[PDB]
Amino acid sequence: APESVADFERLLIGNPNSSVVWMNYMAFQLQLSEIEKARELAERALKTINFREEAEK
Amino acid sequence: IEDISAMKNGFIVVPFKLPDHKALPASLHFMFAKRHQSSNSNESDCLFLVNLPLLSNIEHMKKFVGQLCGKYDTVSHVEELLYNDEFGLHEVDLSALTSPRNTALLKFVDAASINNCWNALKKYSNLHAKHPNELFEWTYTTPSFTTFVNFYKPLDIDYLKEDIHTHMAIFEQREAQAQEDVQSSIVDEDGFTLVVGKNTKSLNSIRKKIKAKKDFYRFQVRERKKQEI
Amino acid sequence: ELFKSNIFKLQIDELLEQVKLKQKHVLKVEKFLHKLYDILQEIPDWEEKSLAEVDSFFKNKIVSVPFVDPKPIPQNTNYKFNYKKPDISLIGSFALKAGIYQPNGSSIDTLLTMPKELFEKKDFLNFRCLHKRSVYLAYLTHHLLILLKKDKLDSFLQLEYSYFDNDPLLPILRISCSKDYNFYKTRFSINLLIGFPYKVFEPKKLLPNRNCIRILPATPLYNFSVLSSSTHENYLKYLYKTKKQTESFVEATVLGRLWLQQRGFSSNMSHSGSLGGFGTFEFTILMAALLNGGGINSNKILLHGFSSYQLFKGVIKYLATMDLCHDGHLQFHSNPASKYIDEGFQTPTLFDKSTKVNILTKMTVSSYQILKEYAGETLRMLNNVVQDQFSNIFLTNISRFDNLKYDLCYDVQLPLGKYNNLETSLAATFGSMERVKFITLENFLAHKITNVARYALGDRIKYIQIEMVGQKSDFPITKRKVYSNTGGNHFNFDFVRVKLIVNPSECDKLVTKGPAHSETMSTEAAVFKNFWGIKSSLRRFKDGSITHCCVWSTSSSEPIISSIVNFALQKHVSKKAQISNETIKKFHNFLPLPNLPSSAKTSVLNLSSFFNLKKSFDDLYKIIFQMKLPLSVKSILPVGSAFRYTSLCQPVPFAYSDPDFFQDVILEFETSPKWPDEITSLEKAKTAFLLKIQEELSANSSTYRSFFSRDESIPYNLEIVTLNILTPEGYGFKFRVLTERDEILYLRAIANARNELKPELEATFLKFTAKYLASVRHTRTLENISHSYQFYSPVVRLFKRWLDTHLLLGHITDELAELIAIKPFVDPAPYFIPGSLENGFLKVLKFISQWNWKDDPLILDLVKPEERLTLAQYKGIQMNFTNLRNSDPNGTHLQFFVASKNDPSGILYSSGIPLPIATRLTALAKVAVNLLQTHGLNQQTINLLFTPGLKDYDFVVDLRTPIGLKSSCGILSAPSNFPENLNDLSEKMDPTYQLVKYLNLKYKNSLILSSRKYIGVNGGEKGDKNVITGLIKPLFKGAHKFRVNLDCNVKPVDDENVILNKEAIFHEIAAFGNDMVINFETD
Amino acid sequence: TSDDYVLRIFAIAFTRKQANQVKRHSYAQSSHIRAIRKVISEILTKEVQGSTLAQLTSKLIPEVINKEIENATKDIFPLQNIHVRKVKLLKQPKFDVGALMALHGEEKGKKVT
C-alpha cells in the first residue's frame, strides 16, 4: 500500500509493467485531484509496459 | 507451505529440491503445469509449463518424465517442447515484420501419454502435500567454463558459406517469382488490370504504399459591394 | 540586450531582496555607536609623556601597548607621546548605506582622528607617528575598558585587538558581543580605526617611491599606511558625493561585494601569502574613479545614467581590458577627470593626485593577474547570450576547497625557527634594506618564495599563489602582537601550501629552457646559471642552437613541476624545508599503468600507444583500400574508445584479454542500389562481403589473422557478424558493415510494427543509431576536443576506472561517461579550465554531486576555446527537454539528459539505465563530497573513495577466475605473440561480463545486477577477483497473483497468491556460475 | 568542416553518350543540368560537413567522392569524367600543435662544453 510519490516510483521500479501499481498510482492522483497528472501517467503506462499483456493494455 | 498442493486457477505446483551448495547452508523450485487448449495442429497434445529452471531442455524433460513414469508405472513419451525463449531474444519477428514469456509448451506423442503424465504430476502434487522428500531433484546441465567458451567460439567458415549460399539462393528464387507475379500483367475477374510502375517488386509493397475566383460572378461582386458599403 | 537585461535585472533585485539587512539591527547598532560617542567624550586625555612614563603606566595597568614591530627604544625616543580628544567619523558599507545581512558576521568602521596640535612635522620618520598611534590606541582601549567597567556591559561585550585588514603596522580595535545594548544577534562588530587628519604629512614626501625610514630604498607599505591613515575620510566624502550623484551606487556596490565574496576576495593585505588587497572599499573607489573618467583620452567610459547591470558590466569589462600593473595604470582626482596612462609601476596603480595615493598597494602582482583573469572570464559569461550565467556567477562560492580552486598544490613545512635562526636556516639574508623593503618577515618570505618559484617555473604555469598555513589577525588586549610558536617558528604560521594555475600544454615540456650562449656571458644567462647552479649546463639541438638549459626526467607518479619546485625551494630558500604532494602522488599511482618499456618514466601526456594503434590501423586501412571487391570500398572509420583516447588503459600489443582489445571500426560500402530489401538477406549479404574480404586477406596478407564472431549485441538481429582481424602489431579490430538499407529497413519495421510493439522497436532503433550513427560523429568531435583539452583523456580514464571499481559500468555506457567527463572542460564556469588529474576528477565529481537530473538538463557546447549552439538550437533542445520531462516528470524511463550538436534528442547515451543505478551514482558522488568536506583531503580518503561500498546489496557473489589475467592484460604488477588457436584466444578471454549480462537478460523482469568489468585493474594483485551485486525489485519482493505472464521464479504462499522464490534464485545463480562461484552472501 | 576550415570545392562533370547512342552530340537539357548541380552540391556539402579535414583528405585521395556522385546521378543523366576539380582553403582556425603532432605521428641535447 504505497502512499507517496517516491515509494510509488520505487514500486514502479519493482514492476513498470504492473497495471496494478500503475492503477494505484493514478487512483491516488484522482483522490488528490490531479487529473491531468493521472492521465499523463496513464500515457506513461502505455509507453512503458510491454506488448505481451494485451489484457492489461 | 506444505498444504499448498495446487492452484485454484487450474495450475498445479511442481516442486524440485536443490543440492547443498558450498556457499549456502534445501529449496523446492516450484513449477506449474496445465494442459493446453489450442486449435493449431502442432500445438495439440500439449502441456503449458510456467517457471521452468535454467536451460530446461528436451533432455531434462526426458529425465523428469522418466522419473514420473518409473515412479507411477505410467508411460508418457515426450515428442517435442516449444517456446524455449528463456533470455528474451526472439520476441519480435523483425524478418516477417519488414518483409508466453518465462513459460513453455510441451508436446507429447498421444493423449494417453499426456493423461498419464497428468495423473503422474497430480500424484506429484499430492507428494508435495504429504511427503516433501519423495519428490525429484532438479539437476541443471551446468553452464561451465567449456560452455561459456563454446559461446565464445569463433564461427565455422563451412557453416557460414553453406548458410549464406542456401539463404541467398532461396531468396533469389522467391524474389524472382515475386517480380514475375507483380509484373505479369495482372487482370481481375471483371476486366480490370492494375497499373504497375517500373522497378516495383511486391504487391505487399503496393498495399503498403496505399482555385476559385472571387471577383467573377455578379452575386459575388454584389456581396462585395454590400460588405464594402 | 533586452532579454538578458530583463532576466538579469529581475535576478539582481531578487538577490538583493533575499540578502537585504535588518533595520532593527541598524537602529540597535546606531544607538550603540551613539553610546560609544558619549563614552568617547567621557574619556579624559593624557599629556606629553616619555617612554618610561608610558611604560610604568601600561605596566601597572593590565593592558599592554601593542607596539608595532620593531618596538620603540629609549635610545631613539627623544620625542614623546600624547592623547587628546579625537575627531569622530563613520566608515563602511553601512556608511555607504549598502549593507546586507551577512550570515558569518560583518563589522563597521569608526575613525578616531588625531589632533594636529599633537602632531609635529617630524613625526612621519622612523615609526614616530606609528608609536604615537600604538600608545594612542593603548590609552583608548584602557579607558574604554574602565568606562565599560563603569557602565557594566562587560557581561556580554567582547573587547579584542585586531589589525586593519591584517595590517601589522595598523593595529585596530575589535568589538563583538555575545548571548539593552546586546547587539550579538545583529551579527555585527565594531572596528575602532585610528587615523591622521587630511594633509598632516606631505603626500609627495609620502609617495611609495620615497624613503621614510633612515638607516636608499623606498618604503612603499610604510608610505601607504601612514598616508591612508591620513586620508581615509576624504575618500569617504568622495564616495558619498558620487553615490548621491548617480542612482545605483549601492546596487553596484552590493553586486561587487557579493561577487568578490564568492570569488574569495577582500580588502585584506595580500602580500603575506593571502588572497586579498581588493575588496568593497577599493571597489567603491574604483566606481567613483570610473564615473570620474577612465579612458586613455580621459573620456567618461562609465555613464552616470546607467543601470546596476550596466555599471557592473562596465567595471568587469574595464578590469578585463585594462592593465593596472605592468604596462599601464589609471589616475584620478578626488577633488580632474580620470585618465589612463601607459605606464605601469609594476604594481596595481590607481593614483589619486588630490591626495597622491596609489590605492591598490595591498595587492600583489599575481593577485592582480588572477583578479584580471576572473574579470575576463566573468566578462565572457556576461557576454554569454545563449545560456544564463547568473546562478553560476553569484550563487556559487568558489573558495571552499583549494584543490578545486587551483590545479596544483604542494605542502612545504618550514622549520625556520627564530630571528637569529634565520641566518643559518634561510639561505637568503635579512638585512637593513631587506627589513625596510619588507618591514614584516612574513611579507619578506612570501615575496621571496613567490619570486623564486615564479622564476623557476615561468612558462610551466599560468598563475601562482601561496597560502601561509597558520595566519591569524586577532590577538588579546594583554599582548604586544600575535604570538605563535608551532611549526618550527616564532611567527604566525604552521607551514606553507603553494597553489598553482598550470598550463597543460606547457607542463610536460621536459627541458627548462633558459637564455642563449655567447662568449661574453650576458646578464640573463649569468643570473640563470647562478640560479640553477649545478643543474644548469649547455646543450645543443638539431637546428644548430647553443643555449643554456637544464634537463629533467619524467615519471609515472609525479610531475616535472613537482620535481622543479622540490629542487628550487630546497636550494634557494632553506636546507630544512619539506616538500610534498602525496595526494597527486597517489592520484598518479592509482592511474592505471601499462605494461610497456619505460612506463615508469612515461608521464601522463603521452598518447604514443594510441599513435601506434592509429598507425597499424592506417596500414590495415591502406590494405583494404587497395583490395578489390564487387563494390568499391566507400569509407572505413574507426569508432574505438582507444581511437578517441578514453579506454581505461592504454592499449598493449598482444594483450587480447583487454575488454577494449578489439576496437570497433565502421566499414561502409558504396551505394549499390541492388541491396536485398529484407533484413535477414541484407544481413547475410553483409556477412558474405566480410567473408570475401577475409578470404582475400588470408590470401594476400597472410601475416594477419582473421575470424568471424557472432555478434547479437543489437536486439532482434540474430545474425550480426564481426570480422575480427589480428595484426602483428599485436592489435585487434572488429569490422562491421553500415548501410543506408539498414537504416531504412529499421524505419520500415518501425512503421509496420504494432502500436504496442512500437516502443520496443524504438528502443532497438535507438540502440542501433547509438552504435552506428551518432557514435562516429561522437568519436570525431571527442578526438578534436581532446587534442584541444589534453587533460580530458587522463581524467576520463581515471573516472571510468572509478566507475569500474564502483561496479556501475554494467549499466553506464562509455559514451555517457565520456560526456559527463568532458562537461567540466567545456563548462569551466565558475572555475578555470582543469590542468591536473586531481583537479579535473574532483570537478567532475563536484558537478555530479551538485547535479539534479530530475530538474536540471545538460547540453554541452562541443567546441574549441575562443560552431557553438545557436539560440534557435538551444531553445529547441530546451523544448525537447521540457516535453520529455513532461512525458516523464520523475525519471522512470530516463533519469539523465545530455545533448550536443551530435544528439538533438538527448536520449541516446542515457537509455536503459535504472533509477536505482542513477540514485546510487548520485549518492556515491554525494558521500564522496561529504567525506572530502569532513575528513580532509588525504590518501586515506582517496582510498575510501576508491574502495567500493559493497552495501545495500541484497546478494553479493564473490567469484574468482582460475587464471590470472593481469600480466596478459598489460597492467604492471607479458604476452608476446598470438597463440595458434583462436579457440584458445577465446579460452584466455574473460567470461564474467557475458555471465552478468545474460543473467540480467534472464531476470531483467525481477533482478538487477552490477559487476566489475575490468579485472586486470580490479581483480586484486593477480587480477582474478570479481563480485556480482544484485538487488531485487520491490514488487517481486512483495507477494502477488500468479499470472500466466508473471515472469518470475515464485513460491506460493496461498493457492492463488505467490511470493518470489529467493533461495531458488540464488541456486540458479550458483548453477549458472557453478565453476566460478566461490562465495555467496545473502542480505 | 567540423575542424572549422572554411572551404570551397569545385567539381565538373561531362554528359557522355550511352552504349546505344546514334546521335552525334550528347547534350543535356537545362533542367537536367540544374538538377545535377543540385545533387552534386548536396552531396559535397553533406560529405565534407560530416567529415573532418584529415578525413577529407583521406576521402579525397582514392577518388571515392566522384564515385559517390556518379552512383547518385546515374538516374538523372549518364555522365563521365566526374571529378572534384579544385579545393580552396579560405579560413584557418586557432592553432593546435598537438593536433598537428597527432596527425603527423621530446628531444634532448648533447651536453656541449
UniProtKB/Swiss-Prot annotation, chain A:
The chain holds residues 1457 to 1513 of 1729 of the full protein. It comes from the Eukaryota. It comes from Saccharomyces cerevisiae (strain ATCC 204508 / S288c). Present with 8860 molecules/cell in log phase SD medium. This is rRNA biogenesis protein RRP5. Interacts with snoRNA U3. Interacts with MPP10. Component of the ribosomal small subunit (SSU) processome composed of at least 40 protein subunits and snoRNA U3. Involved in the biogenesis of rRNA. Required for the formation of 18S and 5.8S rRNA. HAT repeats lie at residues 1-31. It is found in: Nucleus, Nucleolus.
From Swiss-Prot, chain B:
CDD domains: dRRM_Rrp7p. InterPro entries: RRM_Rrp7 (IPR040447), RRP7 (IPR040446), RRP7_C (IPR024326). GO terms for molecular function: rRNA binding. Its main location: nucleus. It is found in: Nucleus, Nucleolus. GO terms for biological process: maturation of SSU-rRNA; nucleolar large rRNA transcription by RNA polymerase I; regulation of ribosomal protein gene transcription by RNA polymerase II; ribosomal small subunit assembly; rRNA processing. One of its GO terms (cellular component) is nucleoplasm. Keywords: Nucleus, Ribosome biogenesis, rRNA processing. Transmembrane segments: none annotated. It comes from the Eukaryota. Pfam families: RRM_Rrp7, RRP7. Plays an important role in the synthesis of 18S rRNA but is not required for the 5.8S and 25S pathway. Is necessary for the cleavage at site A2. Is required for efficient association of RPS27 with the pre-ribosomal particle. Present with 2610 molecules/cell in log phase SD medium. Component of the 90S pre-ribosomal particle. Belongs to the RRP7 family. PANTHER family: RIBOSOMAL RNA PROCESSING PROTEIN 7-RELATED, RIBOSOMAL RNA-PROCESSING PROTEIN 7 HOMOLOG A-RELATED. This is Ribosomal RNA-processing protein 7. It comes from Saccharomyces cerevisiae (strain ATCC 204508 / S288c). The gene is RRP7.
Curated annotation (Swiss-Prot), chain C:
Keywords: Nucleus, Phosphoprotein, Ribonucleoprotein, Ribosome biogenesis, RNA-binding, rRNA processing. One of its GO terms (biological process) is rRNA processing. It is found in: Nucleus, Nucleolus. InterPro entries: NOL6/Upt22, Nrap_D1, Nrap_D2, Nrap_D3, Nrap_D4, Nrap_D5, Nrap_D6. It holds the Pfam family Nrap. GO terms for cellular component: 90S preribosome; CURI complex; nucleolus; nucleoplasm; nucleus; small-subunit processome; UTP-C complex. GO terms for molecular function: RNA binding. Present with 3260 molecules/cell in log phase SD medium. Interacts with snoRNA U3. Interacts with MPP10. Component of the ribosomal small subunit (SSU) processome composed of at least 40 protein subunits and snoRNA U3. Interacts with UBP10. Involved in nucleolar processing of pre-18S ribosomal RNA and ribosome assembly. Belongs to the NRAP family. This is U3 small nucleolar RNA-associated protein 22. The lineage of its organism: Eukaryota, Fungi, Dikarya, Ascomycota, Saccharomycotina.
Swiss-Prot record, chain D:
It comes from Saccharomyces cerevisiae (strain ATCC 204508 / S288c). This is Small ribosomal subunit protein eS1A. N-terminally acetylated by acetyltransferase NatA. Belongs to the eukaryotic ribosomal protein eS1 family. Present with 92400 molecules/cell in log phase SD medium. The modification Phosphothreonine is found at T113. It is found in: Cytoplasm. It comes from the Eukaryota. Component of the ribosome, a large ribonucleoprotein complex responsible for the synthesis of proteins in the cell. The small ribosomal subunit (SSU) binds messenger RNAs (mRNAs) and translates the encoded message by selecting cognate aminoacyl-transfer RNA (tRNA) molecules. The large subunit (LSU) contains the ribosomal catalytic site termed the peptidyl transferase center (PTC), which catalyzes the formation of peptide bonds, thereby polymerizing the amino acids delivered by tRNAs into a polypeptide chain. Transmembrane segments: none annotated. Component of the small ribosomal subunit (SSU). Mature yeast ribosomes consist of a small (40S) and a large (60S) subunit. The 40S small subunit contains 1 molecule of ribosomal RNA (18S rRNA) and 33 different proteins (encoded by 57 genes). The large 60S subunit contains 3 rRNA molecules (25S, 5.8S and 5S rRNA) and 46 different proteins (encoded by 81 genes). eS1 interacts directly with uS11 and eS26, which form part of the mRNA exit tunnel. Signal peptide: none annotated.
